[PDB]
Amino acid sequence: MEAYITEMVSRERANELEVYVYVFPGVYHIMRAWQRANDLPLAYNQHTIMAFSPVRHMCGYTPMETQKRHINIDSPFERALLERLIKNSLIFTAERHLHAKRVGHALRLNQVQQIRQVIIYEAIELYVNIIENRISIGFHLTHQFEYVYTLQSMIEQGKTIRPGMRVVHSNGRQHYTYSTRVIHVRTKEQRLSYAATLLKPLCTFETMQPQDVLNVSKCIKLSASKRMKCTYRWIQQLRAQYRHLTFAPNPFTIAQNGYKLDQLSTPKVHFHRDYATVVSGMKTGKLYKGGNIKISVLFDEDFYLKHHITKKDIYQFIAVLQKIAIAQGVNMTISTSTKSITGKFTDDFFHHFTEEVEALQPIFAQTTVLAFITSTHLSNKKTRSYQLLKQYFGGKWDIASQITEKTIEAFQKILHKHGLKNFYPNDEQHCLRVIDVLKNESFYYTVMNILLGVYVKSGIQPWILANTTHSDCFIGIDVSHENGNSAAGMMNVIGSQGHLIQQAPLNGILAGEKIDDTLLANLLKQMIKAYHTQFQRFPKHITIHRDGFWREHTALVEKIMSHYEITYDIVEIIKKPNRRMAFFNSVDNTFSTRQGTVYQRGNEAFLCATNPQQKVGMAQPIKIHQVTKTLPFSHIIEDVYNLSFLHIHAMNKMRLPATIHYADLSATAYQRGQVMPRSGNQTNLPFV
């Protein structure tokens, strides 16, 4: 049982390697010509070319000087140039002595399986870094899709083609997506057309026939022991034919990479008592902060004409929700203004939505709206009911909203199977039977997810963290880019235990792709004033979480926040680090992954936070970086892990911590004009 990482560190140092350096008065074509003529791995940066071996054929270009030298480790220019040379030499050593082809951003290896005109290829990606005078090489394994035939098969052998189809030109190095017959095709609107014997059709999931996406998906889900044993079996074959660097016989363990192993424990949640599991008291507990909710029902008549479900069947569903809500300490009352709008939400109302939507505002104000729109009307690209509802109900008038035919049909199929078809509204001793049949099966999670989405949008806190963290205030920041527009993702967590989780009441529209200084200052000041409002005292420490890389002004975070004599940390959280971690079991020769595992090396860490099943895939590690050093890094990791269990919006555990997950959701929603600011002191998460 040893901890394994998909990285290695070379025995040689950055200063133990001698290289040849040429400097010329950008210079891509010189390197290209030298590489073509000499058949040797070269690398270039700005106006300097570096290699491991001298160039024989000079290609008529004169440098100022030639050096057979060691690099200068105190400069970043010669550490960036060298990191590309090992990569290029490894690619060179992969193309020869191994049948690999540099396609896109990866190295296609070989065909593993063909599924009815669909070919799957294995591919690998390599990364080189220079850290602390050590050369680190990381590697990742992926797949690639291709179609067997080309435009010839759609011209010859019958068949035909139609305009708008996406085609792929793959000339080896990189591919573009757009002599018997010439077919025009354009994506950049620049005229181009040529032979239809090498343009293939695109192989994405969306443009793929059924019975394939069901079998092309079982050939990319390698559980834990076939994604890892196959990644190592190729690097260990590339090693045997690489001469410029040397490694240990087993360079994949974390000890060879200088990592430290930490095993975090499962937190506890508090609501009227201490519960070990988040899903342990939702069945048998009382919510931490209850209250009163006035719900509304928006019923569509297309839900009846096309699907044999009567409006009354909506109210024997709500009555099941309320009977569950009276337990846990929540009061739901149906608004009385919905009786004057009977027979109004017809099909023409969805075709004509913008013109006749204002008059709905008075009858839905100060309530929570439950929409029962059809799946088609939400998914259709003409009606676009979901986007309009989000943009009007929440984005304009600030009312929370939360069901298609699949849910109701599954509920009624369950009811019919159990044989209960009598009245289940305003009838005790029978709603309990419906609740019992709902339990012991998987629709209970659907019911509780709906209930939790209603609660968190109504201002109810379902639970907090039983124990206390090492920080006081948590701030989550995120940026979303779409169609040349950027949206910020401010998010506030007040209390060490996670007492009050809300969204910063700030205008998240950004002129640029980064947060302005004034916005950051206002965010910090409002965070301080909101923690003071609830706890009557100023916070002692604050930990800022940033999704991605910290690009803001670090010198300004302290300029205002020192003035309050409060300590702070800045943390970067990276999703998709393009690495994997495992626990190899020598006795059984099988890989596995354990939740709450940390690999630590200085101010950087890899964390495992999820436990997916065999058929879903393999867990994705998270990367944690600490820009500051005010607090121990272990206490930084512990807070990131514990904060991930505060998924009060849903009932299924999420991977990222609460701040950044809700920051991403808030940025996505507020990019689309679906959320508007609301000052207050309650748990407000409308975007979910």
Added chain:
DNA sequence: TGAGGTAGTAGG
């Protein structure tokens, strides 16, 4: 869109 997690694809 009940909720979430993983894996592919495209552009920046």
Added chain:
DNA sequence: TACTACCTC
């Protein structure tokens, strides 16, 4: 960043 498939609860 965005999209699409699947499985799990």
